[PDB]
Design an enzyme around this catalytic site. Structure first.
Site, PDB file in Angstrom:
ATOM      1  N   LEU A  13       1.542  50.257 -37.689  1.00 46.95           N
ATOM      2  CA  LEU A  13       1.578  49.785 -36.303  1.00 46.95           C
ATOM      3  C   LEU A  13       2.009  50.896 -35.350  1.00 46.95           C
ATOM      4  O   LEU A  13       1.471  51.037 -34.250  1.00 46.95           O
ATOM      5  CB  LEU A  13       2.497  48.565 -36.162  1.00 46.95           C
ATOM      6  CG  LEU A  13       2.091  47.266 -36.874  1.00 46.95           C
ATOM      7  CD1 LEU A  13       3.182  46.219 -36.714  1.00 46.95           C
ATOM      8  CD2 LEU A  13       0.756  46.734 -36.368  1.00 46.95           C
ATOM      9  N   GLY A  16       7.087  57.099 -35.091  1.00 48.92           N
ATOM     10  CA  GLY A  16       7.893  57.730 -34.053  1.00 48.92           C
ATOM     11  C   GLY A  16       9.356  57.862 -34.416  1.00 48.92           C
ATOM     12  O   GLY A  16       9.883  57.078 -35.218  1.00 48.92           O
ATOM     13  N   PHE A  18      11.944  59.092 -36.522  1.00 43.79           N
ATOM     14  CA  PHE A  18      12.014  59.392 -37.936  1.00 43.79           C
ATOM     15  C   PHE A  18      11.838  58.069 -38.680  1.00 43.79           C
ATOM     16  O   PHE A  18      12.517  57.790 -39.667  1.00 43.79           O
ATOM     17  CB  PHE A  18      13.356  60.065 -38.243  1.00 43.79           C
ATOM     18  CG  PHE A  18      13.754  61.102 -37.221  1.00 43.79           C
ATOM     19  CD1 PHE A  18      13.365  62.434 -37.368  1.00 43.79           C
ATOM     20  CD2 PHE A  18      14.493  60.742 -36.090  1.00 43.79           C
ATOM     21  CE1 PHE A  18      13.719  63.386 -36.422  1.00 43.79           C
ATOM     22  CE2 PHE A  18      14.846  61.690 -35.139  1.00 43.79           C
ATOM     23  CZ  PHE A  18      14.460  63.014 -35.306  1.00 43.79           C
ATOM     24  N   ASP A 130      16.609  53.427 -24.922  1.00 41.79           N
ATOM     25  CA  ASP A 130      15.218  53.792 -25.183  1.00 41.79           C
ATOM     26  C   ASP A 130      14.169  52.879 -24.507  1.00 41.79           C
ATOM     27  O   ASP A 130      12.961  53.014 -24.760  1.00 41.79           O
ATOM     28  CB  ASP A 130      15.010  53.797 -26.710  1.00 41.79           C
ATOM     29  CG  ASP A 130      13.761  54.542 -27.138  1.00 41.79           C
ATOM     30  OD1 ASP A 130      13.399  55.552 -26.492  1.00 41.79           O
ATOM     31  OD2 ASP A 130      13.148  54.118 -28.139  1.00 41.79           O
TER      32      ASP A 130
HETATM   33  C1  LIG Z   1       9.029  44.780 -34.546  1.00 47.23           C
HETATM   34  C2  LIG Z   1       7.538  44.643 -34.358  1.00 47.23           C
HETATM   35  C3  LIG Z   1       6.899  43.466 -34.713  1.00 47.23           C
HETATM   36  N1  LIG Z   1       5.582  43.309 -34.555  1.00 47.23           N
HETATM   37  C4  LIG Z   1       4.860  44.309 -34.031  1.00 47.23           C
HETATM   38  N2  LIG Z   1       3.516  44.127 -33.873  1.00 47.23           N
HETATM   39  C5  LIG Z   1       2.513  44.909 -33.383  1.00 47.23           C
HETATM   40  C6  LIG Z   1       2.802  46.183 -32.903  1.00 47.23           C
HETATM   41  C7  LIG Z   1       1.796  46.995 -32.413  1.00 47.23           C
HETATM   42  C8  LIG Z   1       0.480  46.541 -32.383  1.00 47.23           C
HETATM   43  N3  LIG Z   1      -0.502  47.422 -31.896  1.00 47.23           N
HETATM   44  C9  LIG Z   1      -0.294  48.886 -31.989  1.00 47.23           C
HETATM   45  C10 LIG Z   1      -1.407  49.654 -32.681  1.00 47.23           C
HETATM   46  N4  LIG Z   1      -2.670  49.349 -32.002  1.00 47.23           N
HETATM   47  C11 LIG Z   1      -3.740  50.150 -32.618  1.00 47.23           C
HETATM   48  C12 LIG Z   1      -2.958  47.911 -32.158  1.00 47.23           C
HETATM   49  C13 LIG Z   1      -1.881  47.053 -31.488  1.00 47.23           C
HETATM   50  C14 LIG Z   1       0.170  45.265 -32.869  1.00 47.23           C
HETATM   51  C15 LIG Z   1       1.191  44.456 -33.363  1.00 47.23           C
HETATM   52  N5  LIG Z   1       5.422  45.462 -33.665  1.00 47.23           N
HETATM   53  C16 LIG Z   1       6.744  45.646 -33.819  1.00 47.23           C
HETATM   54  N6  LIG Z   1       7.253  46.837 -33.428  1.00 47.23           N
HETATM   55  C17 LIG Z   1       6.679  48.050 -33.203  1.00 47.23           C
HETATM   56  C18 LIG Z   1       5.343  48.323 -33.510  1.00 47.23           C
HETATM   57  C19 LIG Z   1       4.787  49.578 -33.239  1.00 47.23           C
HETATM   58  C20 LIG Z   1       5.574  50.564 -32.640  1.00 47.23           C
HETATM   59  C21 LIG Z   1       6.907  50.276 -32.336  1.00 47.23           C
HETATM   60  S1  LIG Z   1       7.971  51.453 -31.534  1.00 47.23           S
HETATM   61  O1  LIG Z   1       8.820  50.704 -30.664  1.00 47.23           O
HETATM   62  O2  LIG Z   1       7.119  52.424 -30.907  1.00 47.23           O
HETATM   63  N7  LIG Z   1       9.006  52.043 -32.825  1.00 47.23           N
HETATM   64  C22 LIG Z   1       8.729  53.156 -33.709  1.00 47.23           C
HETATM   65  C23 LIG Z   1       7.287  53.124 -34.196  1.00 47.23           C
HETATM   66  C24 LIG Z   1       9.012  54.448 -32.956  1.00 47.23           C
HETATM   67  C25 LIG Z   1       9.679  53.051 -34.896  1.00 47.23           C
HETATM   68  C26 LIG Z   1       7.455  49.034 -32.609  1.00 47.23           C
END
Ligand SMILES: Cc1cnc(Nc2ccc(N3CCN(C)CC3)cc2)nc1Nc1cccc(S(=O)(=O)NC(C)(C)C)c1
Length: 286
Positions: A13, A16, A18, A130
């Protein structure tokens, strides 16, 4: 708890800092009836980063709010954080896709939810550090949640700020000045960053209108690495601010500019931001 062996990978998903977050299906009956969950792991597992991660897990475990992503549990073998899966992804991506479908009344609904979730954190003396549209997540059309607590800190008992200088790439264009100069993070610096989130939303994530692009243009794109932060500091000290986004009413921009006070103590509280946003919402509905 959750068994490692029953967690089936579906997709990455996000990646970023670490860490990474994955879409997985927890299927402990192997009959493809298990629920889809979000799974967070460390990319390169150190000792300091794992201790941060453990604290992060305890942070989120302690939070229960409509506008904060739900904790589900943990997975051992290397530690993994299991959360609810939010199907509409980041508010950043979602807003960019449905920009013609999302009106100002909707943006203010989202804004109010962000404020309520942010006030709930401050209630527990948690500082988020953040906050950005990339880490605010969309459960459905009528509900967003603060979706990641990777950089979240507990205030010490005796202080209203927390000092931290982390190495590597810092999201400097969302930071209060005192965070850039003194590495001081507080509820008031979260308010600053909330102002930047409000800005983002009202730009509808137009690429050339992002905080980095706007600040970089104001500084001059001829600047390199370490000189960027320095020139940014000076610009903020001289009351250089992000411009009002196209279509933003003046009273919504006023909220933004009030969040961006150089005087840490003169920034609004999250409870007052919510009242003010809610009041503007109520007037647009009449
Ligand atoms: C805690 C959590 C629960 N469900 C989902 N769902 C989700 C997230 C992203 C998508 N996207 C991103 C990718 N894109 C191609 C399709 C839609 C779809 C569902 N995402 C969650 N968090 C999350 C997802 C992606 C990025 C991030 S974040 O906040 O950028 N944190 C990190 C990666 C730096 C650690 C947080």
């Amino acid at each position: 708890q959750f068994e490692e062996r029953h967690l089936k990978f579906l997709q990455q998903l996000g990646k970023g800092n670490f860490g990474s977050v994955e879409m997985c299906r927890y299927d402990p009956l192997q009959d493809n009836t298990g629920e889809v969950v979000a799974v967070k792991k460390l990319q390169h597992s150190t000792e300091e980063h794992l201790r941060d991660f453990e604290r992060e897990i305890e942070i989120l475990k302690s939070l229960q709010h409509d506008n904060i992503v739900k904790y589900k549990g943990v997975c051992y073998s290397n530690l993994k954080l299991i959360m609810e899966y939010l199907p509409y992804g980041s508010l950043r991506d979602y807003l960019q896709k449905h920009k013609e479908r999302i009106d100002h009344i909707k943006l203010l609904q989202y804004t109010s939810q962000i404020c309520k979730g942010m006030e709930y954190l401050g209630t527990k003396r948690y500082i988020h550090r953040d906050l950005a549209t990339r880490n605010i997540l969309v459960e459905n059309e009528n509900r967003v949640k603060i979706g990641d607590f990777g950089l979240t800190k507990v205030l010490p008992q005796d202080k209203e700020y927390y000092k931290v200088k982390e190495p590597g790439e810092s999201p400097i264009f969302w930071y209060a000045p005192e965070s850039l100069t003194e590495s001081k993070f507080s509820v008031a610096s979260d308010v600053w960053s909330f102002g930047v989130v409000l800005y983002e939303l009202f730009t509808y994530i137009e690429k050339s209108k992002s905080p980095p692009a706007e600040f970089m243009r104001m500084i001059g794109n001829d600047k390199q690495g370490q000189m960027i932060v320095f020139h940014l500091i000076e610009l903020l000290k001289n009351n250089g601010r992000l411009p009002r986004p196209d279509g933003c009413p003046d009273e919504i921009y006023m909220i933004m500019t009030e969040c961006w006070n150089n005087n840490v103590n003169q920034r609004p509280s999250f409870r007052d931001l919510a009242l003010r946003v809610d009041q503007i919402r109520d007037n647009m509905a009449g």
